[PDB]
């Protein structure tokens, strides 16, 4: 990779956005009440489930050398394996291709259920040869790299 | 079958990291409530959407 450049200016005030009153931490209160203002509603569990997974250490909160570690991370194919694991679920076949209409589906019908203008930017950006079934195994590509 | 709903949500949370980082793209209309969006919003939600991957992760982890 590359070393930090001025990135660490726009993440320190992207984590000063969260850190309300300046204590140095995020708690799970101060990263509800953004999202509650983007019009969100999480649960405290979905909060702490959030929290602990950037949290290094254990103080329950997060600090901004965590904060970095966190916005510092498509961890070579070890984290394209596993959305190529995800699609592969849905992969009835076990060939490498999915249709159209079951990826709208999935995407649009379970989860946590995304537009369907979402859905159509995400089937517009892998150029379907045609009415054909669209390849994954080049999505997960064009997301990682 | 359980792993369905972890697989769902683990692809669409990292599309949704990954279109986040298209300042054009659709995934902006999803933020109704907020008028209009200026950089110290997309700051927070891209942060809350990495968040939401990297424990779309650790649920798929726990039924794959
Ligand atoms: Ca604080
Ligand atoms: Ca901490």
Redesign the interface.
């Known amino acids: 990779d590359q070393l930090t450049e001025e990135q660490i200016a726009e993440f320190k005030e992207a984590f000063s956005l969260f850190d309300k009153d300046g204590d140095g931490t995020i708690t799970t209160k101060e990263l509800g009440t953004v999202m509650r203002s983007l019009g969100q509603n999480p649960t405290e569990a979905e909060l702490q489930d959030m929290i602990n997974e950037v949290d290094a250490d254990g103080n329950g909160t997060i600090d901004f050398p965590e904060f970095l570690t966190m916005m510092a991370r498509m961890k070579d194919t070890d984290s394209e394996e596993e959305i190529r694991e995800a699609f592969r679920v849905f992969d009835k076949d076990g060939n490498g291709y999915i249709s159209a209409a079951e990826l709208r589906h999935v995407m649009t019908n379970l989860g946590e259920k995304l537009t369907d203008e979402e859905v159509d930017e995400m089937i517009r950006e892998a150029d379907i040869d045609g009415d054909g079934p669209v390849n994954y195994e080049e999505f997960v590509q064009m997301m990682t790299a | 079958?359980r792993?369905?709903?972890?697989?769902?949500?683990?692809?669409?949370?990292?599309?949704?990291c990954?279109?986040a980082e298209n300042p054009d793209?659709?995934?902006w209309?999803?933020?109704?409530?907020?008028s209009q969006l200026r950089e110290?919003?997309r700051?927070?939600?891209?942060?809350?959407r990495?968040?939401?991957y990297?424990?779309a992760?650790?649920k798929?982890?726990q039924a794959?």
């Open positions: 079958n792993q369905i709903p972890a697989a769902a949500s683990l692809i669409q949370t990292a599309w949704r990954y279109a793209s659709s995934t209309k999803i933020y109704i409530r907020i110290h919003h700051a927070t939600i891209k942060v809350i990495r968040m939401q990297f424990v992760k650790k798929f982890q794959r």
